[PDB]
Write a protein that binds this ligand. Structure first.
Ligand SMILES: CCCCCCCCCCCCCCCCCC(=O)OC[C@H](COP(=O)([O-])OCC(O)COP(=O)([O-])OC[C@@H](COC(=O)CCCCCCCCCCCCCCCCC)OC(=O)CCCCCCCCCCCCCCCCC)OC(=O)CCCCCCCCCCCCCCCCC
Ligand SMILES: CCCCCCCCCCCCCCCCCC(=O)OC[C@H](COP(=O)([O-])OCC(O)COP(=O)([O-])OC[C@@H](COC(=O)CCCCCCCCCCCCCCCCC)OC(=O)CCCCCCCCCCCCCCCCC)OC(=O)CCCCCCCCCCCCCCCCC
Ligand SMILES: CCCCC/C=C/C/C=C/C/C=C\C/C=C\CCCC(=O)O[C@H](COC(=O)CCCCCCCCCCCCCCCCC)COP(=O)(O)O[C@@H]1[C@H](O)[C@H](O)[C@@H](O)[C@H](O)[C@H]1O
Ligand SMILES: CCCCC/C=C/C/C=C/C/C=C\C/C=C\CCCC(=O)O[C@H](COC(=O)CCCCCCCCCCCCCCCCC)COP(=O)(O)O[C@@H]1[C@H](O)[C@H](O)[C@@H](O)[C@H](O)[C@H]1O
Ligand SMILES: CCCCC/C=C\C/C=C\CCCCCCCC(=O)O[C@H](COC(=O)CCCCCCCCCCCCCCC)COP(=O)([O-])OCC[N+](C)(C)C
Ligand SMILES: CCCCCCCCCCCCCCCCCC(=O)OC[C@H](COP(=O)(O)OCCN)OC(=O)CCCCCCCCCCCCCCCCC
Lengths: 469, 171, 86, 108, 60, 64, 183, 168, 86, 89, 76
């Protein structure tokens, strides 16, 4: 029911004016809510990890894919509930964060492109769907055309995504050259012994992986994330990561991979030591994206990674989403506003935030402790369940470097708190206008998931046991 | 099952059928006669052709080497039909495929010598054209009157022979 | 009334294409030995025309007819070799 | 040596001859643009290229009876809504400032 | 269409026996090549023993 | 028990409404019917997750 | 008659030559002119291998639309460009001389299935053997290539044509998403 | 002849605790066998989208003042509410064919109608205007397309032989 | 998908060995696939003709050294306008 | 596979080692897709199937829409600036 | 001047408006909607009343499903 939305709304947005864009996005938000509420009984289809192949060996519908398929709609409701809703009703807050006319179209075209990878079986559905979502990132980036950094960022992302798309197509063509089939189950565990496939299957992996930020090629993505406006980048940092990582994790084509193990170590090294001396907040935040997307090639090395992956992905998506929404709240209290597209740029700028309000720093403190794995929080059990699989299957140096990477990373997570609880000299005594109700209720709910998800941890393990085994 | 190359180089082999496959009486008919006599060798040699394709089916991959016995017998009976149609109706058979050698060998262009040949063979050789798979209340196309698709030039000798067959009353 | 000087160019163009196409049909019938051309050629029909060239002996589409084959017809059958296509 | 290939070898010779007789006989010796001009060619390509997605159906129209029909109909009906997007948004029309905005004369 | 399928098994049998004859001729020619130095001319490069026409010949 | 599993999720809902008031710099009881809204919504989530866990346990019971 | 033999290796040499003239040219239009030369050398190879249909599809869309598109862009835009000077591009030579060797040899490695790493490479060149073409009389109607593409895009892979609709949709929405400036 | 399956297919392979009728239901059958509690879900979804928009602007208004949204958006809300209601309707009613929900009053009706057209001598499912290869391909497309209701709508309109039933 | 569809819509040149291997894997419990291996080796050699290439290399290696060359019924090459000349 | 690998490798190094203009990047990217096609289509011929040709006729389309998208991205980049630089974006 | 009344402010009056003032979008959308709407309503009327569908063509050699009863004849 994405395309039932897209085909309808594209005719609806073609005729509506520029003032109607907010209420269009509000409509699409409520539509996605009711698709999640009235249609989420399709979990009953699987009961014992039952998998369906639909459209004729072309799509693959199982329950891992159903969970990612539900996760993406949930985070899209949280993202679309930002563009729909005003932050404050002021002159500044109308000229900041303006949604373009075609933006709401490109989100749902990207979700179509992201869902048709996690659900994908054939290589041609893989290739058409990485193309659909890569175009949508080319155009979600460039839709704020009257920005110098955003246009330079879209033009860089174009050529780098183009090289990695031709590398993937070369690997797909090459696997076709050595075996007649395109589907991954033509492997069926007898090929791989009697066939040198390691080089093909890694080059297929590394083609997607380098699109996401695998760390010899991490420098271009950090530049694109720092250059886009602060609301394009929460979406274009969440979506391609989780979509292809659940692809590469559903179809375990690189087990024991030495190239993947090296680049996993190199990711955990250079992310945690790259974020150390950095003064821009989206930078710091994107290398926190990099180390956490490098607790991913680890599970990609494993076999049977569907508790560790799924728990850590919904952990990371809530935590990610919440801390971007915290600094989007934090821009009202700062003293200096530059650069209309990207209003807070430096982490020096959110000083003394506890003297402005204390509960936004309470929220910020629980999310930044959830990134560094503090045990009564939901972000802890993600690293715990990665480590119950890394050590389960023989990766011992990987475990030590995982630990050292977590410790070096916490040093620049805690810089956010070191800045935000300090004396400011100019405290707020009375704000005349208050922040939007629903858009702060969303962050309060995303906190209370993080701080109280260990309550339901045990239910999730039993549910999981039934529905994936 | 494959279309030829950039630079394909033709070759033959001056050799012999080695020891145990006997000599056979192969069809020396060109495209026009066996396209003309196709329904009649399909009507007489139905179970032999059926038997050969069945034997080729059951020996999967054995195939070529397996049913030498039996593609021997479809050739013999097809040669039998075309010798019989020679000695039966050489003149009207010849009329039909001298028609059908023009018109791209389109069957559409030669109804007139066709119906004459079909009378001749149904009389002497008592074999009949059928288009199978054709459910009733559907007229077979080589029986209908005033078709939409008419040829460019009706050839002359079949005009004359069909008119004389009208005058004699054999048609 | 009608102008003749206006219609003589189109008369020449018409007559040029007319005499061209007439010459073309005669050249095609002379090459094939008195029969019209095959305009749409199947893979089946191409294999069949090659077999006819093999059967009749040398000439293109002579379309001979015989009760059996000659003894040379059994031995003249060809296979086509083909380069590596690197 | 068939009769197709002398023609497409022989024509570049005819062009080279008509060119060499010209070299023999002759005498010898950024501005800003509108978005519509760039957009006609940029947008021409996704409408030229559905045509070649339409080219394999038109050859095999008999085989895919009653089913490839509906697939092609749905393909075209998904393309028509992007067409009606661009014609609802007045995409190709180029505008100018010739109107005096027709504001009534207000006094005092 | 029905005319072509009536003509199919006849030409099929013809190409069948040409396949058998020219194949066994290539096998015997390669046998007379490989006399002396010990090497199997008769063992096929398949494992399921069937009759494949050869391919990939030596450039004439 | 079903009842404590409702009351705890309703308490999570009261915490959501409370913390959402406190980010907006409102008092604790600002719109005191909104506590009823959030309590009923999160309690309904507890209903859903409770019933999914029930049915999953019964599916495990039927495998013997 | 064996003048007509080396036709494939000829076009391979011409493609090498033509890309050397892509990446070493003065004007930005001279490079796309050798690029349409490269498309037509490719289309000659595609006819040569046995695919007459594709060669003309490559002429229709690759010296068709996207050619005209690039020629068009280079016309109505100014683009500064330097020349291939030795003082700015000889520093890249010892990396190119490594990456040529490594990328070519490794791109010729994966067509093989042994595990020696020298018998893998030597199966790419050790193929001078002529495939034998038999006539099978099993096919009755001229289902050529384009018929089978129209049967597989429309029945077996109808979803790929139907997602493809969304991709061409996006290729229409995108340039209007950008280049309009509504109101 | 146009009703022979000639592929191999699982027989009575139930997807839940209840016995399946049907592996893909034809669209007319799904609209036939749906309960009144299902038309309920359609009505609740047509009611929940315009009331949902008016509620969600009662929370925070668009222009700072609480005004009702225009009738223009209420019409589109009613349309997409029928869209969600029909998606949930087809989705529920075809879970009942798979034997994954409670399957009591439809197994009897599918005894009844299949037995009532075995008596009239015609095909148990119906004669399509397709060759049997197109029936196989067109029902490999429409097999289990109700998963992926979150992405795309796809339905059965093909009327092919096999449905995972006992004999044919 | 388009599993074994040919250029002309039929079957590939290696469809039989693949269908034999899928018969093998259909009746075989997982981790009992070692008995399934010879059908697979037949299929990979159908695709790439590797063992046939090595065998013809060894036959040509013994052939090419000898001064006698060829004492066998030879393989005669013809030009394309002379398929059925004699 | 020689002509495809050569177009791919040499087009790739023509992409990597430019510093002079922006359009050589676009046209080297386009000839890489050509180089992938030249390998795929011959594997379709030599294996006797259309399914490599299926991926070919799909990637023709994706190369097309890729060019349409990316040249609209360039006109975005040029509208706001004055002249596309020599050294790059 | 002729302005837009709206499709929602009276449908049939709007179609009457668009037939006069925009015939390049009425008689273009009305000739293309008369195809897939007539394909759902005019086809069973034909299959019952004008003529039923045709028999399908053969595609390959039609193999039967028998077990080779032994043929007699054409031995030598
Ligand atoms: C059969 C009978 C003959 C056919 C019917 C003949 C009439 C055909 C409709 C005419 C088109 C409507 C129209 O206004 O004219 C042109 C219309 C121009 O409108 P306008 O007056 O210029 O707008 C200017 C206003 O200022 C702007 O005013 P506005 O802001 O109010 O917007 C106007 C409106 C204009 O658009 C419309 O009013 C058309 C809306 C109609 C939608 C439904 C039509 C299809 C009906 C199917 C019937 C099925 C039963 C068939 C059973 C047959 C059994 C044998 O646009 C929209 O509001 C957005 C479209 C919303 C579409 C919702 C579609 C999804 C729900 C419906 C399908 C549900 C299926 C669920 C199944 C899936 C489950 C997973 O042109 C278009 O914009 C394109 C139309 C796209 C149609 C989609
Ligand atoms: C809400 C409901 C959805 C609309 C329903 C309208 C159809 C209807 O009620 O007819 C009943 C009618 C009942 O007749 P029956 O006598 O009871 O039995 C049928 C015979 O067995 C049929 O005879 P057969 O068994 O021998 O099979 C042959 C059949 C074989 O037909 C097939 O097999 C076609 C299979 C394709 C299914 C298509 C599913 C749609 C995919 C949506 C796009 C997915 C995007 C994914 C991208 C990623 O051939 C046909 O009959 C084709 C008729 C072609 C007429 C084209 C009409 C175009 C309408 C387009 C409307 C689109 C916009 C609507 C929304 C606004 O069914 C038909 O006659 C065939 C209808 C096929 C038309 C498919 C139209 C799909 C459009 C819906 C998609 C959007 C909404 C979701
Ligand atoms: C974009 C533009 C597109 C460009 C196209 C042109 C070229 C494209 C090719 C490059 C594509 C991209 C390359 C990506 C990196 C290649 C990935 C790669 O190394 O796999 C290698 C293949 O081992 C060679 O045999 C590797 C040997 C390769 C031959 C070396 C090269 C020869 C140079 C001569 C000087 C192995 O991986 P892997 O860790 O899974 O392999 C391990 C490991 O081998 C075993 O010890 C383990 O026991 C086993 O578990 C296994 O998993
Ligand atoms: C998605 C929601 C969740 C995201 C994170 C997920 C958590 C898991 C599930 C959570 C379940 C969520 C259930 C919805 C909860 C319903 C609910 O409490 O009433 C709402 C929140 O309403 C959403 O904010 C609605 C939330 C967003 C939906 C937008 C469209 C409605 C409470 O606002 P509120 O009383 O302070 O708002 C007040 C009050 O309405 C009046 O005093 C004024 O008119 C107004 O200006 C403001 O001061
Ligand atoms: C009335 C609604 C009002 C509007 C609300 C809108 C959106 C609400 C969205 C999300 C709320 C949280 C629901 C979580 C469902 C998890 C299902 C599941 O644990 O998944 C398991 C497998 O997971 C996994 O592998 C691991 C996931 C690990 C999750 C880590 C964070 C969890 C901690 C907090 C989450 C629970 C908080 C409960 C709050 C009362 C599969 O089981 P399933 O797919 O059958 O469950 C869905 C059935 N369903 C659709 C009917 C609900
Ligand atoms: C017989 C009954 C059915 C006839 C229905 C006719 C509706 C006529 C549509 C219409 O009113 O078009 C005019 C209108 C123009 O809008 P306007 O106010 O002038 O301002 C923007 C101008 N660019 O609206 C428009 O903007 C034009 C948008 C529609 C353009 C349609 C042309 C695309 C080709 C359509 C192919 C047919 C599709 C039919 C659907 C098939 C599936 C059912």
């Amino acid at each position: 029911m994405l395309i039932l939305a897209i085909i309808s709304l594209i005719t609806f947005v073609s005729m509506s004016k520029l003032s109607d864009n907010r209420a269009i996005i509000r409509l699409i938000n409520i539509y996605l809510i009711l698709v999640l509420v009235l249609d989420s009984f399709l979990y009953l289809l699987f009961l014992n990890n039952q998998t369906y192949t639909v459209m004729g060996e072309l799509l693959i519908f199982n329950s891992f894919t159903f969970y990612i398929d539900m996760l993406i709609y949930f985070i899209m409701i949280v993202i679309s509930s930002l563009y729909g809703y005003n932050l404050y009703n002021n002159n500044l807050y109308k000229t900041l964060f303006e949604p373009k006319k075609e933006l709401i179209i490109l989100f749902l075209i990207n979700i179509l492109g992201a869902l048709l990878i996690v659900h994908s079986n054939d290589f041609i559905t893989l290739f058409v769907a990485i193309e659909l979502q890569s175009y949508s990132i080319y155009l979600i980036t460039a839709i704020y055309n009257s920005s110098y950094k955003a246009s330079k960022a879209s033009m860089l992302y174009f050529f780098m995504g183009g090289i990695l798309s031709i590398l993937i197509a070369y690997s797909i063509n090459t696997y076709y050259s050595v075996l007649n089939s395109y589907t991954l189950h033509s492997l069926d565990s007898l090929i791989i012994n009697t066939l040198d496939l390691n080089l093909i299957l890694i080059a297929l992996s590394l083609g997607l992986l380098f699109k996401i930020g695998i760390a010899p090629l991490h420098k271009w993505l950090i530049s694109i994330y720092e250059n886009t406006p602060i609301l394009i980048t929460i979406y274009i940092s969440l979506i391609p990561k989780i979509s292809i990582l659940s692809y590469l994790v559903l179809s375990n084509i690189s087990i024991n991979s030495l190239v993947i193990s090296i680049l996993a170590i190199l990711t955990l090294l250079v992310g945690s030591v790259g974020g150390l001396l950095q003064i821009k907040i989206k930078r710091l935040l994107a290398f926190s994206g990099l180390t956490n997307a490098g607790y991913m090639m680890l599970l990609l090395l494993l076999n049977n990674n569907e508790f560790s992956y799924l728990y850590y992905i919904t952990q990371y998506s809530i935590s990610h989403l919440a801390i971007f929404m915290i600094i989007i709240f934090s821009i009202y209290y700062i003293n200096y506003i530059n650069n209309q597209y990207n209003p807070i740029i430096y982490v020096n700028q959110l000083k003394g935030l506890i003297h402005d309000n204390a509960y936004l720093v309470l929220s910020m403190a629980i999310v930044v402790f959830s990134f560094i794995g503090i045990p009564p929080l939901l972000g802890f059990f993600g690293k715990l369940n990665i480590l119950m699989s890394i050590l389960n299957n023989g990766y011992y140096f990987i475990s030590i470097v995982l630990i050292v990477a977590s410790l070096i990373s916490a040093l620049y997570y805690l810089y956010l708190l070191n800045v935000s609880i300090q004396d400011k000299n100019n405290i707020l005594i009375n704000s005349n206008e208050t922040v939007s109700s629903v858009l702060s209720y969303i962050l309060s709910s995303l906190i209370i998931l993080i701080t109280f998800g260990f309550i339901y941890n045990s239910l999730i393990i039993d549910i999981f046991n039934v529905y994936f085994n | 099952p494959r279309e030829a190359a950039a630079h394909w180089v033709p070759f033959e082999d001056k050799a012999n059928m080695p020891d145990n496959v006997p000599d056979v009486v192969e069809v020396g008919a060109t495209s026009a006669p066996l396209l003309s006599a196709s329904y009649f060798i399909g009507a007489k040699c139905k179970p032999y052709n059926d038997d050969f394709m069945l034997c080729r089916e059951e020996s999967q991959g054995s195939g070529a080497i397996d049913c030498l016995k039996e593609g021997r017998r479809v050739t013999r009976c097809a040669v039998s039909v075309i010798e019989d149609i020679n000695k039966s109706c050489l003149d009207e058979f010849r009329l039909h495929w001298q028609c059908l050698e023009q018109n791209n060998h389109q069957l559409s262009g030669c109804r007139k010598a066709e119906a004459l040949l079909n009378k001749c063979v149904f009389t002497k050789l008592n074999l009949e054209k059928k288009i199978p798979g054709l459910r009733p209340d559907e007229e077979p196309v080589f029986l209908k009157k005033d078709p939409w698709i008419k040829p460019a030039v009706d050839d002359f000798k079949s005009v004359r022979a069909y008119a004389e067959a009208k005058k004699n009353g054999t048609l | 009334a009608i102008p003749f000087e206006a219609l003589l160019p189109y008369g020449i163009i018409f007559g040029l294409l007319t005499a061209g196409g007439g010459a073309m049909q005669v050249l095609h019938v002379y090459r094939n030995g008195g029969v019209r051309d095959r305009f749409a050629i199947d893979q089946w029909d191409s294999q069949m025309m090659e077999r006819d060239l093999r059967l009749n002996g040398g000439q293109g589409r002579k379309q001979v007819d015989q009760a059996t084959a000659p003894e040379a017809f059994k031995h003249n059958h060809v296979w086509k070799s083909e380069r590596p296509l690197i | 040596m068939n009769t197709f290939i002398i023609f497409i070898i022989l024509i570049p010779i005819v062009g080279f001859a008509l060119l060499a007789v010209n070299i023999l006989l002759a005498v010898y010796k950024r501005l800003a643009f509108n978005a519509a001009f760039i957009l006609v060619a940029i947008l021409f390509l996704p409408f030229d290229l559905e045509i070649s997605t339409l080219l394999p159906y038109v050859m095999s129209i008999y085989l895919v009876s009653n089913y490839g029909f509906t697939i092609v109909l749905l393909f075209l009906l998904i393309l028509i809504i992007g067409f009606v997007y661009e014609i609802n948004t007045n995409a190709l029309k180029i505008n100018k400032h010739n109107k005096p905005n027709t504001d009534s004369l207000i006094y005092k | 269409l029905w005319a072509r399928i009536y003509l199919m098994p006849l030409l099929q049998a013809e190409e069948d026996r040409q396949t058998v004859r020219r194949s066994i001729a290539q096998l015997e020619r390669e046998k007379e090549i490989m006399k002396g130095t010990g090497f199997d001319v008769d063992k096929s490069v398949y494992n399921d023993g069937k009759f494949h026409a050869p391919a990939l010949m030596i450039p004439p | 028990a079903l009842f404590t599993s409702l009351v705890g999720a309703s308490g999570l809902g009261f915490a959501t409404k409370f913390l959402s008031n406190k980010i907006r710099l409102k008092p604790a009881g600002y719109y005191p019917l909104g506590y009823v809204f959030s309590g009923v919504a999160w309690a309904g989530l507890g209903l859903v997750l409770h019933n999914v866990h029930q049915h999953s346990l019964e599916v495990l019971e039927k495998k013997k | 008659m064996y003048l007509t033999y080396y036709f494939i290796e000829i076009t391979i040499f011409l493609a090498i030559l033509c890309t050397i003239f892509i990446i070493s040219a003065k004007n930005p239009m001279v490079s796309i002119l050798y690029m349409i030369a490269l498309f037509v050398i490719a289309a000659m190879y595609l006819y040569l291998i046995g695919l007459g249909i594709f060669s003309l599809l490559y002429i229709m869309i690759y010296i068709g639309a996207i050619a005209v598109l690039f020629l068009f862009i280079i016309t109505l835009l100014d683009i500064n460009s330097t020349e291939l000077s030795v003082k700015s591009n000889i520093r890249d030579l010892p990396l190119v001389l490594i990456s040529l060797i490594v990328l070519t040899i490794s791109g010729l490695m994966i067509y093989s299935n042994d595990s020696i790493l020298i018998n893998k490479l030597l199966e790419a060149f050790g193929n001078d053997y002529n495939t034998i073409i038999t006539q099978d009389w099993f096919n009755i109607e001229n289902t050529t290539l384009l018929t089978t593409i129209g049967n597989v895009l429309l029945t077996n892979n109808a979803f790929i044509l139907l997602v493809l609709a969304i991709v061409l949709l996006l290729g229409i929405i995108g340039p209007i998403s950008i280049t309009m400036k509504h109101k | 002849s146009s009703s022979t399956p000639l592929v191999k297919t699982s027989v009575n392979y139930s997807y839940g605790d209840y016995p399946l009728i049907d592996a893909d239901p034809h669209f007319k059958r799904v609209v036939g066998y749906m309960r009144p509690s299902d038309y309920g879900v359609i009505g609740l979804a047509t009611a929940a989208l315009p009331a949902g928009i008016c509620f969600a602007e009662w929370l925070d208004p668009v222009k700072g003042k609480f005004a009702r949204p225009s009738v223009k958006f209420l019409r589109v809300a009613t349309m997409l509410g029928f869209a969600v209601g029909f998606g949930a309707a087809y989705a529920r009613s075809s879970l009942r064919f798979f034997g994954v929900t409670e399957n009591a009053r439809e197994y009897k009706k599918d005894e009844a109608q299949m037995a009532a057209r075995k008596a009239a001598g015609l095909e148990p499912y119906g004669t399509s205007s397709l060759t049997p290869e197109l029936q196989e391909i067109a029902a490999k497309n429409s097999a289990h397309s109700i998963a992926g209701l979150f992405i795309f709508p796809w339905f059965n309109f093909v009327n092919h032989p096999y449905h995972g039933r006992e004999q044919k | 998908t388009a599993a074994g569809i040919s250029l002309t819509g039929g079957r590939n040149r290696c469809f039989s060995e693949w269908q034999s291997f899928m018969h093998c894997t259909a009746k075989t419990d997982a981790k009992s696939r070692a008995q399934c291996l010879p059908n697979f080796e037949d299929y990979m050699e159908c695709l790439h003709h590797t063992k046939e290439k090595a065998r013809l290399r060894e036959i040509e290696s013994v052939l090419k050294q000898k001064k006698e060359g060829l004492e066998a019924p030879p393989v005669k090459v013809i030009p394309v306008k002379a398929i059925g000349l004699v | 596979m020689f002509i495809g690998t050569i177009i791919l490798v040499l087009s790739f190094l023509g992409f990597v080692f430019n510093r002079r203009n922006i359009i050589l990047a676009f046209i080297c990217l386009e000839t890489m897709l050509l180089g992938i096609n030249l390998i795929l289509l011959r594997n379709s011929v030599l294996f006797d199937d259309i399914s490599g040709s299926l991926f070919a006729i799909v990637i023709i389309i994706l190369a097309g829409v890729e060019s349409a998208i990316g040249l609209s991205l360039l006109v975005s980049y040029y509208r706001l600036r004055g002249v596309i630089n020599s050294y790059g974006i | 001047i002729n302005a837009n009344p709206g499709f929602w402010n009276g449908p049939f009056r709007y179609l009457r408006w668009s037939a006069h003032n925009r015939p390049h979008l009425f008689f273009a959308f009305a000739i293309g909607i008369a195809g897939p709407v007539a394909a759902l309503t005019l086809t069973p009327l034909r299959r019952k009343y004008l003529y039923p569908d045709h028999s399908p063509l053969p595609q390959s050699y039609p193999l039967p499903q028998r077990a080779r009863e032994g043929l007699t004849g054409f031995d030598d």
